[PDB]
Structure formats: C-alpha cells, structure tokens
Design a protein around this nucleic acid. Structure first.
Ligand SMILES: Nc1ncnc2c1ncn2[C@@H]1O[C@H](COP(=O)(O)OP(=O)(O)O)[C@@H](O)[C@H]1O
Ligand SMILES: Nc1ncnc2c1ncn2[C@@H]1O[C@H](COP(=O)(O)OP(=O)(O)O)[C@@H](O)[C@H]1O
Ligand SMILES: Nc1ncnc2c1ncn2[C@@H]1O[C@H](COP(=O)(O)OP(=O)(O)O)[C@@H](O)[C@H]1O
Ligand SMILES: [Mg+2]
Ligand SMILES: [Mg+2]
Ligand SMILES: [Mg+2]
Lengths: 256, 50, 415, 259, 255
DNA sequence: AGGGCTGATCGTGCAAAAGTCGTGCCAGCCGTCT
DNA sequence: AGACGGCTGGCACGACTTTTGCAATCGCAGCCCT
C-alpha cells in the first residue's frame, strides 16, 4: 500500500492515484513524468503493492548508472560462460521481468543501441545476450518514470519513434514540487510525525508557522526524500524535538 | 566362507545336494559338481565326516 | 572490459587417496575385507556344540512321513527327487516333466510322476508341491467338507475364473460366472482363506542382521551421535620393527622400514580423518535429524550433495565417495547414509523438497479411502491441497509408485 | 503453406498491393531488404515474411542490431570455436551460425560498426561462414531479410552506410504506406484494435465513437504509423473505460498538458 | 577457373595481364574503381596458379578481431591461454603455398599492418614463444577496391604496405568504362534469372530498355547489371511482355 | 678434483562424459452409463 | 454404445547429480667414474 505514505493532499495526487488504479489492472507501459527529488519510485511501489500481479516481482534496476556498456549485455543476458570468467548470466533483472513489469529511473542516458535492443525486447523479447542460446520471453510488463523533458528528448531524438512510441503507453506527470502545496503541508506534517516517532525524540517539536512558511517558500524541486533530507537537516537544527519546533535547516553547506 | 573356515568344496556340500554356486539343485545329481561351484550333490552328514 | 578467457593460474596424479575413496565408497564389510587383504603384507599394520539341536526344515518332515508311508524304490526315488526341488512356499519348483527327466527312467512317466505326487500331494500339509499353485487351493478346499456353503461357487470360480478376480473385476466376474450378487463375494472370501504358500508357513525363524556403525541417541536434543568404536578400523605401528630398523646393520634397510612405516602411518591417519570428516558431516546431519528424524521422514527436507558439501570443506566428490554404502543405527534404528539425500520439488509448501514418508502415508490414506476402491490421483491431489503443498496427478502416480501403491482401478475390492 | 495472417491489419491503402508484391516475392529466397516506419507495419511485415518463409522453412532467426555491445558481437558473428572467447567448451555457434538456412532477419538499426557491415558483407559472400579460431570456412545457408526506415541513398551520398552495405544489399526495395499516407483502413483497423482492446478490457459493450474522433483521426499525423495510432486506440479505450458508451474523443498525446 | 567473363578487349586485356601473372606467385594487390568481380578475379587467379593443386582458398583479411592477430596470422596457439595447447598454424600455413586472396585489405588496421607486413617481408613462422620460425612461402597477393596511393597521401598504410604487392595492380574498366558485352552479359544474367525465377523464357526487353542500359550510370558495376536485371524480372514476373521497363532505382519510390 | 648426471621429489578434485531424473502428459482402457 | 474420463506411462527434454581418472617440475646429491 506504500503505507499510504507520502500523502499528497493535492487531489491531483489522488487523481494521479486514480489513474494509477485504473492502470492497476491494466498491463501496458506507462511513463511517469517525475521530478528532481520527487519520488516516482515510491509511487511505483504504491502501484506495485496494488499491481494486477501485485504478488509479482518488483525490482528497481535503472541503467542511469550504466557505467559498463557490458552491464547492459548482462541485463540483456549472458550465455552461460559467455565471454568467460563467469559461470552463467546473472539474470536477476530478467528474472523479475517474467512474472513482473519493467521499472527504470532516468532512462535518458541509454545507449541508443541499448535502447533499441530494449525495443526488440518489448515487442517480442528474445532470450538475449545469451551467447547464441535460443530465444525466450519474460512475462514482462513495464513502467517508465523520469524528470527529463520528453520534448527535449524528442528534439534530441533521444527516443526513437519505435522507441518513444512502443516504449510509452501512459504518462504520469509528477506534480511540480510546488504544484501540490496543500499536499506539501500534508506530507510535510506526515514526515514531521513520522520523524518525531521513529527518532524516539521524546517530544515532537511540532513546527514553527514561520518555519512552515519558509519551508513552503522552498521551491525545493528536490523533495523525494529531499523533503525528508531537509527534514533531517531541520531536525538537527532543532537537534532535539523536546522544545517546540523553530530550528529549520535547509542549506547545510553553510558553516556557522 | 571361501578357501577358509566353513568353506564349500571343503568338508562337504551345501545345505542341500545343491552346490554352493547354485547349479545342480535337485536329487538328480548324485556326485555331479558344477563348473560354477564344485560341491558334490550329496548328504550333509559328512560335514562331520570330512 | 572486453571480456573472455585469458591465460593465468601441473604434475603427476596417483591413485593413493583414489584407492582410499574406492574403499570408503565400498561398504565397510568388504571394505574391512580389503583392509585385511591390505594389512596382511604390511607387517607394521595391525563350546563347540552349545545347544546342538537339529530340525525338520519341512521337506525332511515330509520325508519323515514318506518313510512311514508305504513306497517302493522307484516310488521312493521319485518322491525324493520331487522333494529335492521344493520351494519355501510349498509350491513345486519344477514341473512334472522336469521331474520325469530328473528320474531318468523310461519306465518313469508323467502319469507315474503325477500319481506319486498326488499320493504325496496332501500328506502334510494340504497343498504341498503346489505345482503352479491353483489346483493346490483346490485340493485344500477338497480337504474341507462339502458341508461348507458356497464351496461350489468358490470351486467354479477357482476352476477357470482366476482372471476375473485377478483384476478385481467383480462386474465382469458376475457377468461371466453368473455368480450371485453379494453372494459370490462369499465364495471369494471362502477362497481367500485357503492357506496360500502353505509350505511357507513352516518357515518362520530368522536371526538379526544390521550393523550399527554410528549411534545418535538423541542425547538431550540434538542427538549425541557417535560411531561404532569397534567397527572403526585401526592399525598398530610395529614398534618392535620401529626398533628393529635403525639398529639394523643395514641402517639403510631398517631406516627404509621406518620410512615405509611412516608412510603407512600417514595412510592410517588419513583414513581416520576420513572417518572424522564423515563424523562432523554426521554432526551436521544429526542436527538435521533432531528435527527430521524426530519429525520423521514425513517432515524431512530434501538435501543435496552440494548442500552438505557446502557446510564442510569436503569436496563434493569427497562426500559423494565418503558416504557410499553407509548406514547408522539411530533412535529410529539402523539407517543408511545413501538414504539421507532426496530430490526437491515444486510443491506449494513455499519450498522445494522430497515426498518420502509423505508419499508413503499418502498411499496409506489413499488405501484408507473407502475399501470399495483405491483413491485416484485426484484424491492425492486434494489430500495435498488439504496439506497445502502442491502435488500433481502425474507427480501423484510417481509418488505412489515410489510408495508402490496399487492402481486406482486395480485395488477396488468388495467392502 | 497456411494463412497465419495474424494481426496483420489495416492495409486498405495500397499496402494491400504492397502485400501483393510481397507475395510475388515470397517464393524467392534471395536477399530481402525493405523500408518503412519502425514499430509500424515493419516488424509486422517481418512476421509477414516469416509467414512467407515456409512454415517448414525454418527458424525465424531474429537479428536485433541495437544489441551486440562492441566486440564478441564478433564472436557470434564469425563464430567462436576456439578457447578464450565464449566460455570455450564446444564450438559455440554464433547467432549467425544459429541460422543454418534461417532468416537473416537483418534489422536496420544504424549502429556504428560498418566493421560489422563489412563482416556481414562477408556474411553475404558465397554462402559461407568461419568462426573464431574457426579453423575452416564452412559454406553456409540462410534466408536473408532486411528492411529500412530512412534515406539509404542519402546515407550513401552521406557515405553513412558502407556503399557496399547497400551494394550487396537490397535486390530491390520495399517501402511502407505512411500513416500520413496509408490512411485508408483508418476506421477499419481502428475498430479492429478497438475490438481487441475492449475484449481485453472485457468491456461489456463496444462504446462506439463519435465522428469528431474520426475527424481528428483524419486530422492526426500519426507519426508512428501502425502502433502509435493503435496505442492511441487502446488509450481511448482506457481513458474511457466504459461499455456501449459512445466515444467522442481519443487519447494519444498525453504530453498535451491537462486542462 | 570459369565465370561470367566481361568478354572485352579491356576485359580480355586484364585476362592476358593476369595470364602474364598466372604461374607467378609473387605478392600482389588489385587496382579497381570498384571490384567488378574483385573476388571472382583473384578467385580465377587462384584456380589457375601452381596453387591449383595448392590450396586455392582465400582468407578475408580486414575481417579479423583485435587481440588475436597472432593466431590469425598463425592459426590457433598452443600456449596462448591455458585452454588450447596445440600450435595450430597459419591460416597462411593452412594454405602455405596455396592461393589465399588477401581481400579486405583496404579496411585493415594500423599496427595490424605493422606486424603483418614486416612478417611477410621477412619472417618465418615465429608464433607465440616458439622454437623456430618456418617460412610459409604462401602465394602472396592482396587487393584494393580503393586507391592506395591515395592512402599514401593520407599515409594511413605503411609505405612498406606500398611495397607489399610484388605485382602491378591491374584494374578493371569502370562500368562507365567497361559497358562492353552488357547486352550479351545481361542476356546471360537474364537466362540465369529466368532459371532462378523458374521463368519459361525471355521474349526480351524494350530496345528502350536496351538504351536505358546504355543510358545507365551503373555504380554497382558488376552487381547492378544482373541485379536490376532480375529485379526488373521479379517486379515484372512477366515473360509474355518485354521488359519495356526495368527495375531502375529500387531506391526510387514509385508514384 | 670435475664431470655427468641421472634418475633421486611428490603429489591429488574435479571434470566430462555420462547418467539420470521431474514432470507431466497423450493413447488406450476400462467403467459404465445413459 | 459411444463418446466420456481418469488414469498411467513413455516419452522427451532439460536439471541436477555425478564419478574417474589423470600422471611431475624445482631441486639433489650421491654416486660413480674418471
Ligand atoms: N510518496 C513518498 N513517500 C515516501 N518517500 C518518498 C515519496 N516520494 C519520494 N520519496 C523519497 O525520495 C527518495 C528518493 O525518492 P525518489 O526521488 O522518488 O526516487 P527517484 O530518485 O527514483 O525518483 C526515496 O528514498 C523516497 O524515500
Ligand atoms: N493492425 C495493428 N493495429 C494496432 N497496432 C499495430 C497493428 N500493427 C502493428 N501495430 C503496432 O505497431 C508496433 C510496432 O510494430 P513494428 O513497426 O512491426 O515494430 P518494428 O520496429 O520491430 O518493425 C507494435 O507494437 C504493434 O503494437
Ligand atoms: N568476371 C566476373 N564473372 C562473373 N561474376 C562476377 C565477375 N565479376 C564480379 N562478379 C560478381 O560480383 C559479385 C562480387 O561482388 P564484388 O565486386 O566482390 O563486391 P565488392 O565490389 O563490394 O567487393 C559476385 O557475386 C560475382 O557473381
Ligand atoms: Mg531519482
Ligand atoms: Mg523491428
Ligand atoms: Mg566489397
């Protein structure tokens, strides 16, 4: 249920959620136009716990950090002892896909070749990178999510027509950081309470309404747990939640 | 046992006139001894007479 | 980066530990046989009657009656030859024709052989020398008075209707023999108590034969397993020859004796270490047994050679040779080590493991289904669904054959 | 020798005649190269030819070029029989070797290795192939299957393809009626996809659609020829999710900001 | 030893030229705007030479892969990585006197040249750590569908690579040049295609088609003639009517 | 006093081939039955 | 009375196991002859 966590009082958070629910039995691709430090992962979770195969695998492997060109070939497979130095393909991602969907983070960097290889997957999905092994398909669904500008990619041609198309089946715009302002107050207090509890801080400092206003002033584009991150900052600013809350920390680089 | 204590082909035949290997298991063979085992198809009293 | 295989990373093998593993995989009975046949040349490698009572053994009991029975020399020879090839069950091992050939008399014919057998067919007991038993139960019933009812129905069935009861085909049996409904079963039951293998009855006695090699006594939970001390082989170093070598004027010959002795000491220590590694492996297995054996074979997880060799530093070949032909007596009793492992499965017990006594007790319940008919594989599947563990009808037929259960439409019997 | 028509749908343009010419080609096993919109009739055309491949023809050896990393792409290319390349063991037969008689399901991926290009040139050389350490050549056989999605002659003038990439390639060309062009089974394949879509939705009754939707459908470019529309169709199905409930609009460009 | 000859004074001239080259086994490379049966050329040469009984079996040079040129020059190694242990010898040695067309030469690589040249100029079989090199005097010749002297201007190859060919590089006429028996040549191409198309027979084409054959740019010289020939065939598939039109630019899209 | 020198050392686990099983599942069948 | 069926097993193919079957070099130095 994602603990129902990350409450978005923006009824658009709900509306997104409703779209999600409609999508929940639905089994086709989806983009989530996410935000910098927003938290598409958590919502994708909230979906997965609700997935039509909610009992299905839920893996988080993004190729954003695909420092290895071969980390790909792996993710596409390996023959048992392909190349060599190895026993078998470490197929965990390929495992989650069958009996699962596809979830990635910041699909921008992909080698275009890697991408269209993913293309030869989505329409059909052979046993891949398998060093000549016969094909095989993973009963794999999909979901997409990023903070990038899709038009910027389209200008970049970053997504091929086959790619941009067959890749995409739904679009989930994360509300802008400041978009869900009532939601901001909401999940903000949500964190406030969650922190005051788990910190075991004997008292909860609460919140200074001035601090609340200053926090609202934070465009805070990053808020994924960047909300939670600045939250921990502010907690330390208080240091201890015994006193009523006023010490709010946003920018921690500052000495003094 | 074999070429040792309580051995067939030694001190006499097996429980029946039947030889130790298994061949000649009947009353038909009076002194016949199998190729698989040589034990006269005979009476067991001579276990105390050989 | 650009992956593949690249050069990096020899000598002479000997079958030393290899022959040792040949011994270990070989059973300790013949393994000690070799151990003796080994230690023989290695010189540094270390009332009469009681009760004395004879018995009949049945066939001689038959001969005892034959002696009192009036018989001729040819008659005695035919009867004795008939007695010679006699089975424990009391059925005739060889046919009448083989007996006629064994008599080797042209005067001896099949009719004379049959007459001799029949005069000796029911002397003691009824149904002796059954000769493809069928007329044996017939003679047994004939011995019974005709005053017993349904004797005629049983007789007609036994005459030429053995096949109908062979498949438990009661409907076809009734359609063929025209036997009475709910009454032909009475003739069937009167036939059922007919002393089959009546000669097998005389044989009843045996002595004990199973060797406790290791002993886990469930000592205060997590059994204190221990091997058999006397069964564990051990040599004694020739300390006399150890002192007969150096002082030997051929200090070379005697010191070489010392060297061969040291090498054999290495061999014996390696065998003892093999025993001790098997023992620590047994410690792991006994940790397993404190639940498995204590929960019995029903609640037993299938293990693998990989699984056990992982807990040890022993090689998979090392263990795979080590336990071959090994059995230990436990609180349950003498149990084979080769029995320890089992194949795993796709059951929805959340895991993969083996059927075993689950399959056995499943056969038990399938039989425990209405004695009218055996429970089909669907019954097993439903029983497993109740068990919450996935089992399949092909898998059910497999596990049943493992328990060696009768077929669903072969074990149907009149209740 | 059977139908296997599958979801080859919406050919009311001369894509029907396109199929006809495809049929005229279908008996011949010579090199196949085509052209058209990615993810759009294209790999469906591939299925089409795979049917044109006798059912008993053989393995529709799919060739997906956007894969292959860099190097031992070479391995399965030329082959790998020796040690030190593909776990050694047996002569690992490459996907190229995997096809013996099979489909050279060449995909026009426009990846960098014209190195590869020359290789495949030798792949299309004399009916032969030779492995890594591949101690002997071996005269090979396979059906040959390419297609396209961009200006091959231009890239030739652009030099971008190996001249011989095309020179060996394309006994003839085979293009596609664009979505800006085909435009004929619009409502037709529209309804076909809609039928599939509701059926999967198990939607109780066909919503129906207003004519404003079809007017937009004519108005729409549909840059992705086959699927982009089809995705749009399923998307209408979803964004509605109502049975018998006549549509009046469709879902394609979610990048369109919400109102 | 036999192929679709160009039947032409330039073609028969290159024929006599190679014939002058026939038993000659000294190194060589090929000149030629394109290839015009580049393989077929070296191939018939292979069928001719004293390497007729020798191994008249080529090897595709610039095919090869990065780390393994050693073995490539010299077959599989005994001591390379642990796995193999047998000094399997040169693909050259797999001929070592046969006819093994050094093709793909143009696309070859830099240090790749650095070795192969020097060895060919001088080097017996010095394999990985071996005892004694053995010179496989293997019938030597390369090729250039491109302009080496241009490459020299670029300087990509060795001037030694320039030395490589011990023979002058014959060239064939451009299609624009050659264009000699293309009537008869196409006729044979068509007999072929009709056999391949299993077609009954060819009534012919337009004489307009003949002129378009004359009015043909013809880059894919040795290919495109028969190529678009049978292409016209199949796009026609029709033998009752002349190939009045032929399959011009498959790259062109019809209206 | 120098050479030869030669056989004097001393090991072992795992792989490669083989087998072999899980698992089920189509064909014939039997029950009987409507 | 004829198709129903449930079963059962052959069938086959992967999945796992699995045994057997290898064969000194680096030195040494002692010897032996010369
Ligand atoms: N609704 C939410 N509930 C709880 N945590 C969230 C939520 N949205 C974002 N986050 C937090 O943001 C951190 C990074 O989140 P996010 O930015 O969603 O991941 P990604 O970087 O993949 O978008 C996560 O560890 C998560 O705790
Ligand atoms: N008749 C149709 N109706 C709806 N969608 C279609 C139809 N034909 C093809 N598509 C869609 O077009 C997409 C791309 O197909 P295709 O162009 O063959 O891929 P490729 O790039 O491999 O050629 C597929 O995902 C498929 O869903
Ligand atoms: N003299 C010839 N006789 C017959 N066929 C030829 C001749 N020259 C070229 N060819 C044909 O040309 C093809 C080889 O093309 P080629 O010129 O080697 O390509 P590239 O120019 O890319 O090297 C062969 O299939 C062969 O049939
Ligand atoms: Mg992120
Ligand atoms: Mg495609
Ligand atoms: Mg070329």
């Amino acid at each position: 249920e994602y603990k129902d966590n990350l409450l978005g009082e923006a009824n658009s958070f709900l509306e997104v959620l409703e779209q999600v629910s409609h999508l929940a039995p639905l089994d086709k691709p989806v983009l989530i136009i996410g935000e910098r430090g927003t938290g598409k992962e958590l919502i994708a979770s909230r979906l997965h716990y609700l997935s039509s195969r909610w009992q299905g695998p839920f893996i988080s492997l993004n190729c954003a950090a695909l420092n290895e060109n071969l980390l790909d070939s792996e993710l596409f497979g390996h023959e048992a002892g392909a190349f060599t130095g190895a026993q078998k393909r470490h197929p965990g991602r390929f495992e989650r896909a069958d009996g699962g969907t596809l979830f990635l983070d910041e699909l921008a960097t992909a080698p275009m070749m890697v991408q269209e290889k993913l293309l030869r997957v989505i329409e059909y999905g052979e046993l891949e990178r398998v060093g000549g092994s016969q094909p095989l398909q993973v009963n794999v669904r999909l979901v997409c999510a990023t903070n990038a500008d899709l038009p910027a990619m389209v200008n970049e041609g970053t997504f091929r027509a086959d790619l941009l198309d067959r890749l995409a089946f739904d679009v989930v715009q994360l509300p802008p950081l400041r978009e869900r302002e009532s939601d901001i107050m909401l999940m903000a207090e949500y964190f406030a309470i969650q922190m005051c509890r788990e910190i075991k801080l004997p008292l909860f400092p609460g919140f200074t309404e001035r601090a609340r206003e200053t926090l609202l002033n934070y465009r805070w584009p990053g808020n994924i747990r960047e909300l939670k991150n600045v939250v921990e900052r502010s907690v330390y600013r208080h240091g201890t939640s015994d006193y009523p809350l006023d010490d709010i920390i946003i920018d921690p680089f500052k000495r003094r | 046992e074999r070429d040792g204590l309580f051995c067939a082909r030694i001190f006499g035949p097996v429980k029946d006139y039947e030889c130790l290997c298994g061949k000649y298991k009947r009353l038909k063979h009076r002194g016949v001894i199998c190729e698989k085992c040589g034990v006269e198809v005979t009476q067991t009293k001579v276990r105390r007479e050989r | 980066m650009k992956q593949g295989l690249q050069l990096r990373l020899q000598l002479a093998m000997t079958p030393q530990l290899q022959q040792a593993i040949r011994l270990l995989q070989l059973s300790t009975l013949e393994l000690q046989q070799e151990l003796q046949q080994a230690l023989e040349s290695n010189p540094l490698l270390e009332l009469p009657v009681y009760q004395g009572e004879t018995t009949q053994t049945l066939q001689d009991y038959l001969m005892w009656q034959v002696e009192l029975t009036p018989f001729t020399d040819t008659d005695r020879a035919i009867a004795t030859s008939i007695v010679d090839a006699v089975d424990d069950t009391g059925y005739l091992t060889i046919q009448i024709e083989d007996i006629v050939d064994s008599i080797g008399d042209d005067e001896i014919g099949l009719e004379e052989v049959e007459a001799v057998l029949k005069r000796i067919q029911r002397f003691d007991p009824v149904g002796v020398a059954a000769k493809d038993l069928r007329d044996c139960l017939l003679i047994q019933l004939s011995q019974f008075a005709k005053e017993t009812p349904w004797l005629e129905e049983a007789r007609l069935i036994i005459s030429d209707h053995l096949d109908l009861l062979a498949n438990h085909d009661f409907r076809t049996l009734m359609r063929v023999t025209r036997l009475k409904e709910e009454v032909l079963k009475e003739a069937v039951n009167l036939i059922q108590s007919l002393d089959p293998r009546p000669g097998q009855s005389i044989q009843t006695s045996e002595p004990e034969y199973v060797i406790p090699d290791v002993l886990v006594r469930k000592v205060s939970g997590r059994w204190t397993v221990e091997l058999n001390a006397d069964s564990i082989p051990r040599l004694k170093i020739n300390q006399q020859y150890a002192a007969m070598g150096n002082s030997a004027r051929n200090d070379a010959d005697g010191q070489f004796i010392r060297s061969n002795l040291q090498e054999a000491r290495w061999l014996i220590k390696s065998l003892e270490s093999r025993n001790d590694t098997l023992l620590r492996v047994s410690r792991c297995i006994v940790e397993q047994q404190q639940a498995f054996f204590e929960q019995g074979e029903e609640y037993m997880k299938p293990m693998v050679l990989a699984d056990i060799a992982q807990a040890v530093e022993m090689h998979e070949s090392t263990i795979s040779r080590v336990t071959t032909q090994k059995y230990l007596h436990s609180p349950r009793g003498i149990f084979e080590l080769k029995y320890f492992f089992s194949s795993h499965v796709n059951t929805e017990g959340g895991g993969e493991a083996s059927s075993t006594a689950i399959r056995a007790l499943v056969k038990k319940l399938i039989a425990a289904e209405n004695p009218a008919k055996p429970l089909s594989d669907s019954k097993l599947t439903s029983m497993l669904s109740e068990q919450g563990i996935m089992v399949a009808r092909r898998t059910v037929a497999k596990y049943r054959e493992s328990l060696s259960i009768p077929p669903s439409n072969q074990r149907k019997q009149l209740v």
